[PDB]
Amino acid sequence: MSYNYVVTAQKPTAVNGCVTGHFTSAEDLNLLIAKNTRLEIYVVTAEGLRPVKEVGMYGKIAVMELFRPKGESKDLLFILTAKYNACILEYKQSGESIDIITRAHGNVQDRIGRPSETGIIGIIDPECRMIGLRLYDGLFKVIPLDRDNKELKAFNIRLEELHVIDVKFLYGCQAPTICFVYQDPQGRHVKTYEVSLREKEFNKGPWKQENVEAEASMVIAVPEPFGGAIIIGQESITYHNGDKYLAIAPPIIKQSTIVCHNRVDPNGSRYLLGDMEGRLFMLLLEKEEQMDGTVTLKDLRVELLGETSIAECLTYLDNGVVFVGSRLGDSQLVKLNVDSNEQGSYVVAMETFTNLGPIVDMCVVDLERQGQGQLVTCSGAFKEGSLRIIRNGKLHIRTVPLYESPRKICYQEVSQCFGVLSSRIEVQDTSGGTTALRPSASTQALSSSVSSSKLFGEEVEVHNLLIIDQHTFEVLHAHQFLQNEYALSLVSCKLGKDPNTYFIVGTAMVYPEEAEPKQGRIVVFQYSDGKLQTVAEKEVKGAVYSMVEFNGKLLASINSTVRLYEWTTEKELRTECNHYNNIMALYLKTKGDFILVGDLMRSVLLLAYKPMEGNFEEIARDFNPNWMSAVEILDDDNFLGAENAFNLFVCQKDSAATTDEERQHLQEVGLFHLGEFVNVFCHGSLVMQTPTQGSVLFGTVNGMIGLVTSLSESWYNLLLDMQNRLNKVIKSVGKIEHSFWRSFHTERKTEPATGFIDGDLIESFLDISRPKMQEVVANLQYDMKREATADDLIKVVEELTRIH
Amino acid sequence: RTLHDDDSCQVIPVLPQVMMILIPGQTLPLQLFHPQEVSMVRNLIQKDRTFAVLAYSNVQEREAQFGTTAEIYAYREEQDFGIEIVKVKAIGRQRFKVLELRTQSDGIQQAKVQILPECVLPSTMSAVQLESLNKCQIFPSKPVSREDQCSYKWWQKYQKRKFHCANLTSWPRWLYSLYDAETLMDRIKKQLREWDENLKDDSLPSNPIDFSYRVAACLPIDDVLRIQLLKIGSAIQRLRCELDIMNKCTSLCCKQCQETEITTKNEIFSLSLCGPMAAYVNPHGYVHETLTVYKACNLNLIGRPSTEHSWFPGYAWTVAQCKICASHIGWKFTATKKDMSPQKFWGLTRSALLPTIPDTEVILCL
Amino acid sequence: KALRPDMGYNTLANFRIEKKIGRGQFSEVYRAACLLDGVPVALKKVQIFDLMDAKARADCIKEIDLLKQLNHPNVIKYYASFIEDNELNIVLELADAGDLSRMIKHFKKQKRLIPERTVWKYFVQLCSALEHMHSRRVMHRDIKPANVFITATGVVKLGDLGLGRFFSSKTTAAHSLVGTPYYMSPERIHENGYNFKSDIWSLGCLLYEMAALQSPFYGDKMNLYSLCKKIEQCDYPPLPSDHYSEELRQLVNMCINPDPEKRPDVTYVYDVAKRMHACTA
Numbered sequence A: 001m002s003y004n005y006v007v008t009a010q011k012p013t014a015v016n017g018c019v020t021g022h023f024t025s026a027e028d029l030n031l032l033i034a035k036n037t038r039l040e041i042y043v044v045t046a047e048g049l050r051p052v053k054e055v056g057m058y059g060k061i062a063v064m065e066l067f068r069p070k071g072e073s074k075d076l077l078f079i080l081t082a083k084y085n086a087c088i089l090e091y092k093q094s095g096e097s098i099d100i101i102t103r104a105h106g107n108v109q110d111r112i113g114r115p116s117e118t119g120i121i122g123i124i125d126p127e128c129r130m131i132g133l134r135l136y137d138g139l140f141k142v143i144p145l146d147r148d149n150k151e152l153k154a155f156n157i158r159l160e161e162l163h164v165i166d167v168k169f170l171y172g173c174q175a176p177t178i179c180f181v182y183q184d185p186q187g188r189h190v191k192t193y194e195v196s197l198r199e200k201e202f203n204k205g206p207w208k209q210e211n212v213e214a215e216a217s218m219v220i221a222v223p224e225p226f227g228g229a230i231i232i233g234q235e236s237i238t239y240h241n242g243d244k245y246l247a248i249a250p251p252i253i254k255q256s257t258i259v260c261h262n263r264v265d266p267n268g269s270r271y272l273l274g275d276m277e278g279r280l281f282m283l284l285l286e287k288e289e290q291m292d293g294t295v296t297l298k299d300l301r302v303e304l305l306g307e308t309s310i311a312e313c314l315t316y317l318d319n320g321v322v323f324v325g326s327r328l329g330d331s332q333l334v335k336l337n338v339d340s341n342e343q344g345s346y347v348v349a350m351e352t353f354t355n356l357g358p359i360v361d362m363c364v365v366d367l368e369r370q371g372q373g374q375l376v377t378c379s380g381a382f383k384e385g386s387l388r389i390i391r392n393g394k395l396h397i398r399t400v401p402l403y404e405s406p407r408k409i410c411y412q413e414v415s416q417c418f419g420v421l422s423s424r425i426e427v428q429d430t431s432g433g434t435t436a437l438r439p440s441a442s443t444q445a446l447s448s449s450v451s452s453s454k455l456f457g458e459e460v461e462v463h464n465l466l467i468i469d470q471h472t473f474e475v476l477h478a479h480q481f482l483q484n485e486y487a488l489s490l491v492s493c494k495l496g497k498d499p500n501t502y503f504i505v506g507t508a509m510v511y512p513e514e515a516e517p518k519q520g521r522i523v524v525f526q527y528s529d530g531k532l533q534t535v536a537e538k539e540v541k542g543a544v545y546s547m548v549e550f551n552g553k554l555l556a557s558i559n560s561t562v563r564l565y566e567w568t569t570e571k572e573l574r575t576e577c578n579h580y581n582n583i584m585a586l587y588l589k590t591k592g593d594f595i596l597v598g599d600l601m602r603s604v605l606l607l608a609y610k611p612m613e614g615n616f617e618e619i620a621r622d623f624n625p626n627w628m629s630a631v632e633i634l635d636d637d638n639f640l641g642a643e644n645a646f647n648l649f650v651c652q653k654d655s656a657a658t659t660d661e662e663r664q665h666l667q668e669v670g671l672f673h674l675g676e677f678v679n680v681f682c683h684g685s686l687v688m689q690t691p692t693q694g695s696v697l698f699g700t701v702n703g704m705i706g707l708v709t710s711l712s713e714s715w716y717n718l719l720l721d722m723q724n725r726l727n728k729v730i731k732s733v734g735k736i737e738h739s740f741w742r743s744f745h746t747e748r749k750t751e752p753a754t755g756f757i758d759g760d761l762i763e764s765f766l767d768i769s770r771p772k773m774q775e776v777v778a779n780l781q782y783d784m785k786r787e788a789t790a791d792d793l794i795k796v797v798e799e800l801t802r803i804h
Numbered sequence B: 001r002t003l004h005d006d007d008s009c010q011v012i013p014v015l016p017q018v019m020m021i022l023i024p025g026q027t028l029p030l031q032l033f034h035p036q037e038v039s040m041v042r043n044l045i046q047k048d049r050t051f052a053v054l055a056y057s058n059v060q061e062r063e064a065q066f067g068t069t070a071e072i073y074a075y076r077e078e079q080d081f082g083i084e085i086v087k088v089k090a091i092g093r094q095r096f097k098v099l100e101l102r103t104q105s106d107g108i109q110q111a112k113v114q115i116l117p118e119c120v121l122p123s124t125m126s127a128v129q130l131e132s133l134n135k136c137q138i139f140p141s142k143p144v145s146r147e148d149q150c151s152y153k154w155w156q157k158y159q160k161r162k163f164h165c166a167n168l169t170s171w172p173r174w175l176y177s178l179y180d181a182e183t184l185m186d187r188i189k190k191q192l193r194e195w196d197e198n199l200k201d202d203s204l205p206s207n208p209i210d211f212s213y214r215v216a217a218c219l220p221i222d223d224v225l226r227i228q229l230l231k232i233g234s235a236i237q238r239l240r241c242e243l244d245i246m247n248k249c250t251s252l253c254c255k256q257c258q259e260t261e262i263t264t265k266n267e268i269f270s271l272s273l274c275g276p277m278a279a280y281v282n283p284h285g286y287v288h289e290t291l292t293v294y295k296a297c298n299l300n301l302i303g304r305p306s307t308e309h310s311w312f313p314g315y316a317w318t319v320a321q322c323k324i325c326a327s328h329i330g331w332k333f334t335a336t337k338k339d340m341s342p343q344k345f346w347g348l349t350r351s352a353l354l355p356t357i358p359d360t361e362v363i364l365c366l
Numbered sequence C: 001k002a003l004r005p006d007m008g009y010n011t012l013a014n015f016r017i018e019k020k021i022g023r024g025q026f027s028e029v030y031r032a033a034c035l036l037d038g039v040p041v042a043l044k045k046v047q048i049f050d051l052m053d054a055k056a057r058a059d060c061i062k063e064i065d066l067l068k069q070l071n072h073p074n075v076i077k078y079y080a081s082f083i084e085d086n087e088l089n090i091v092l093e094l095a096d097a098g099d100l101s102r103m104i105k106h107f108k109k110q111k112r113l114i115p116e117r118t119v120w121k122y123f124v125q126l127c128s129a130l131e132h133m134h135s136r137r138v139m140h141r142d143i144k145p146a147n148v149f150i151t152a153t154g155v156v157k158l159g160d161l162g163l164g165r166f167f168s169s170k171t172t173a174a175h176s177l178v179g180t181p182y183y184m185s186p187e188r189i190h191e192n193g194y195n196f197k198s199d200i201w202s203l204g205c206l207l208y209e210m211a212a213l214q215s216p217f218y219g220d221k222m223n224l225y226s227l228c229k230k231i232e233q234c235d236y237p238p239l240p241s242d243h244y245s246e247e248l249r250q251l252v253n254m255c256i257n258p259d260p261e262k263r264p265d266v267t268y269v270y271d272v273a274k275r276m277h278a279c280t281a
């Protein structure tokens, strides 16, 4: 039986949502940010942002909106998690004690439901009378915001439109109304429905305009005096208010799709619109003079302000300062210098906040040889690409912006440099060739080359291998690959009887006509005297997804084959043995002579290299169909993986089995809903080298770095009973049980967690007060078994913190 | 027709001597002569019309572990001779795991079975679809682009937008398209229209679970691969395996010889509305899933051509067998009239063929 | 009407007898139609439980299992065999177009000898059939013009396979021919077992009947005492020189030899037949 401990070394840094209002006090302007499972509260000041309180919520914050019921002095916050855990929270501070209470709570998941394609949408009526949640197709959930609604009793109104794109509660409505853009085989259309709490029927709204843009994806409720809604597609911005239907197609917005928005003025005069390329535009609503009709929009204007990080969300604060909640790169407070003549408005970034997500690939290194490990990651995507050096000493982080997508990374100790596969997007130029969009690591290298092997506007992805120095981080070399060649894998290792360490790259010839890759190659490079040299080349009939040094030999996965090459004295990759399997070998991990092979659909197996046979023997298989992102070998019997809805699982080889059926089947001995999407696993530790054995770090899409370690049965059972006692004492945010949050979850099922210990909940034992520590350690046994004291278990939890 | 619930255990009668692997959606014509089998069907008409069809892995032995439920959609009783001949047409509905086999005193078997669930997994990009891109995730349905399309142009834009979030993960957009339900169905449609020339999306299903089971019935595959496709629970894995069979197993050899090539994928074409493979019935109630091919090799004609019970009217059938092991493979059909195109073709039974990889040295993957 | 698909070719239920086409000394052949696929077959029923003892039944059944495994175009393939209603049923490839005995009888009616080019055309096909059988160590034991079938397209197929080997002759007779091949070899006069050399004697004697339109010991068939003595002494009229070649006639004299060891193996008979067929065609 396997037992593991998962603790968060670096909290998720990527921002998925940001909101503004008056949460702490009516006279305090707040900026609340959602970094997946955490919620940060800030006060807007001339000095930027003042930190107030960060809370650890047991759920992925899917909806986050502020609202003030009539009578309440300050705003309340509504949070709906990925597992549909709805709740309304209130800020409460008595002197110094800051605590976020749960006014209302509940699980609004319907008994049977069809989850919508445009995700979870949560909107609140301007008068704080109901919460409209569009979770499933054809069912609009309504939660009345009554005085005694502590358990959030909800009802669904049968909506005829199934493929609804976006819904928002309109302003300038005597009776509540919801405007939406829906799609049907005839096209995209706009329609309004008056929401009735008494009759529970969607009454005919004030207007409904048909034949809107094919890409109409966003809806914005315009407040009084303007009223109505703004619909934004890709190439046009429209405004609808029954009698009025304006539509503008400026050429400055047609090059990219507008994907995020935020209101600047409470009256709706100015709006911010961010696009996929990180550009920021200002949408102005010009108001015309009043006889008695202040509800008159004269004209719409769009002005490109400047280039900001790739914005997931935007939030205007004060003095032209806008928080840019970026998910791909560093979040940032930018100043809009509109205060000149209104003609030339430019942006100036004023403060950048570190974001390590998406962590695509990473490697543990020791550049200073001080014992303490350093983690260098391939963070960011597109212009937000970067290499982040995390070291423990509270973790210090240095950023190296690449301005292009880093894909893979490896370290070469002999030449003091890192191998980094990266990709840049070049548009198909007017002359027929290709032109780069912006300067980047590959184009601004000290030395650069193109592979000499020979075996309109469309975006083209160009892959390159970067040899970056370990101290200065300057791009020493940038070897560009062939046309229609996708670099997939990269390793740095010594092979055969050759003392030189080589950078090996596995590629796939990707053509749009070829559905599956029928061709690819393994290129061996040597970096000596400041320059990279193409040493060997081995063409293969398939894609080289993964490679690994296996006992001084190169093991590689080619489509559905696991081949082993032995480096000859003539510097050529000669084949030794093959293993053709029923799986597309995507993941490859090795420990000694054992090999773990995996699929994108959790179809995994374990092979073993037998020198007597000179070929691979299939040891065990486990074909449970479910999506995957990464795998790692914990030990000869236990193997870790990550599956579909942010889960972690462990499969074990049944060694004590008698039959071939039982020995050839890996038993699922571990399950845990992590809440993060794991892209990479790496053996190593940030601390210099206990109740633990092994150290497996992991990188996620949200920029969270975690750590998994094996424990004995006695430590596991002690921490499992201690975990239950801590859970039944700690006040969870939104009254969400820890058991439910960490229970394995998919759209098919939600089973309890097993073989895993939530290290974050175990470390919270030192944060709780002494009277609450006595409440937890009461009647708990510790090993002869004696009654556990608070002081002895404080030392055990402190030893668990010393690993990260 | 209401279908059974998932993982629910059902006690249903297994029809005797039906040694075949029925696939959900596949039609099963049957001719019954025994009053015990006829009275069982008569009582099933008064109930849910559902019986069991076991997938016997071993022919000689009763090694049956999986199966498929069959709902009787049409009943027909004849009293032409002293024997009340009852012909019924059934349709497969759900797969099952055999829990118990109870042979009754009247020879009819009763099988307590667990209904297997269909593994419906969400899109791979659902776990990493950004909130800003959720709103622009749905593709616009319009007759100007979704119909009369270039196909090369539309599928490029489909991959770019659906798998845009592949930059967040450790894999490319094209890899996610290999495990994509719509892309795999499109790739199978391309290979299937080559054989079934007069085919359209109006006949093939839209759902990937229903599409994969339809493809398994159409494909000329032996009982070994037919069991393997039903063992696969996920439709993505089933479509990937089916498409790998279509690309790798292009040679159709004699099952008895194993190394005697009879025909290839390129020779497959259609002359029936059902498709290239169709389940015809002979004058004695035997069903033959015959594949319609243009040319066939290593086959000799035995006997003289005949016109009685000819499945293709206006074509004289002649018995064909393997030139090496003399095992029955099919029948050669020659046109009676000169203008009737094709001039000559072969109808090969599925039970006699074996899909093999062309002569060289690979496993079929999921 | 019973139909048992699971059994296949191993039951009477899946076959309908069209008409009786033959009856051997120890067998009954019928032109039957397979009700599963319409393949025309020759259902050969043999009453093994009536006169064959448990040991002779087992030796015959064991040999029939290996005869199904045979694979040659010029040999009648044994599709399937089964015991039903105390009767050994053997399913064979139907060859109702004719046989070497019918062709020889037709040429006798027209008063013309078969051309030597046509003789080697059919002898070379039968030599390949016996070469494959002897390579797998299988004895025919009854090579005769009736068992050498010829299709409408001119393809030769050796079949039936001699059952006579079980031989007993329980009557108190001076000489016996029941349960012996068409061309009885001298070793078979002593009522001893069979050997591969007996098939060479029968093959050689068959080549004689192909050339002279009569068995080498035709005429003596009436008086068995002279026949038994003439087989031992190999006293037969030699083939005429003015009609056939020296190579054809010397091969007959080599195969028709009293000492089994002096008879050449099927390897050399098939090699000579291939050389003669290549020259004549």
Ligand SMILES: O=C1CCN(c2cnc3cc(CNC(=O)[C@@H]4Cc5ccccc5CN4S(=O)(=O)Cc4ccccc4)ccn23)C(=O)N1
Pocket (backbone or CB within 6 Å): B281, B282, B283, B286, B306, B308, B309, B310, B311, B312, B317, B331, C016, C017, C018, C019, C033, C034, C035, C036, C037, C038, C039
């Ligand atoms: O186009 C196709 C492809 C081939 N095919 C097909 C598939 N499986 C079969 C099986 C048979 C079996 N039946 C027979 O062999 C025979 C002869 C015969 C000849 C031609 C048509 C029908 C019949 C009927 N009989 S009989 O025994 O009943 C009549 C009979 C009774 C007594 C004495 C003598 C004869 C036939 C066709 N089969 C089609 O069905 N159509």
Ligand SMILES: Nc1ncnc2c1ncn2[C@@H]1O[C@H](COP(=O)(O)OP(=O)(O)O)[C@@H](O)[C@H]1O
Pocket (backbone or CB within 6 Å): C021, C022, C023, C024, C025, C026, C027, C028, C029, C042, C044, C076, C092, C093, C094, C095, C096, C099, C142, C146, C147, C159, C160
């Ligand atoms: N395989 C066969 N196909 C067709 N006819 C056959 C076959 N075997 C025997 N016969 C016919 O049966 C008759 C001889 O019966 P058979 O049992 O072969 O006896 P024998 O070998 O003693 O002559 C002949 O009319 C012959 O044509």
Ligand SMILES: [Mg+2]
Pocket (backbone or CB within 6 Å): C142, C147, C159, C160, C161, C162, C163
């Ligand atoms: Mg015989």
Ligand SMILES: [Zn+2]
Pocket (backbone or CB within 6 Å): B254, B255, B256, B257, B258, B260, B322, B323, B324, B325, B326, B327
């Ligand atoms: Zn064959």
